[PDB]
A and B are shown apart, each in its own frame.
Chain A
Amino acid sequence: MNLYTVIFINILLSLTLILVAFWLPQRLPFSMKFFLVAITFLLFDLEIALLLPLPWAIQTIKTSTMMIMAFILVTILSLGLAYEWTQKGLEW
C-alpha cells in the first residue's frame, strides 16, 4: 500500500504535467543485426535470470555444486558469445 500510494502520486505528477502541457498552451527499416541483437539479448537476459538466485544459493550447504554449476553456466554462455563473435554475428 505504501508503495501503491507512492506510485499513484508518481503517475499523477506526470499526468498532471502532460495535461497542463496540452492545456496551458491556450517504413521498412530492417537489419537482421538489430533483430539478432534483440535475440542475443534475451538469451543473455534469460541467463541473467538463472544467475540471479546466486545470492541465495551462495548460502547453500553444498557450495561445491553451487560453484560447479554456476561456473558451467557462465562458461557455456560465454562460449555462445564466442561463437557469436566467430560468426558474423556481433560484427554488425
Chain B
Amino acid sequence: IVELPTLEELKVEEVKVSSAVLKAAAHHYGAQCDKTNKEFMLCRWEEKDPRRCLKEGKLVNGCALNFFRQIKSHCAEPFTEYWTCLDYSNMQLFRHCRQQQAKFDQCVLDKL
C-alpha cells in the first residue's frame, strides 16, 4: 500500500493571507520564526519523507499565525498601509514602497 496520511491528520490552520502580506512581513517572519521553521525544514531535508515531518509542519503554521496575531495587536495599521502599496506593484518590488516600510519597521521597533 502507500500509507498516505489521513486528512484529519493533515488538517491544520494556515496563514491563508495574500502573498503580498507574507512578503511585506516576510523579513520579520524570517526573524521571529525560524527556530521552528528551520526545525521543520531540517526535518524535511534529512528525512526526505514529508509524511515523516508533518508534525513539525503544523508547528510552522502555528508559530506564524501568532506572529500575525501579534502584528494584528500592534503596528497593524502601519502593516496594512505597507502591504497595500506593496501589492499594487506587479512584481511587488520592495523599493517602490520604502516610506511605508519605514513606518511599520520603525513601529515594530517601538511596540514589538
Are any A and B Cβ atoms less than 8 Å apart in their complex?
A: no
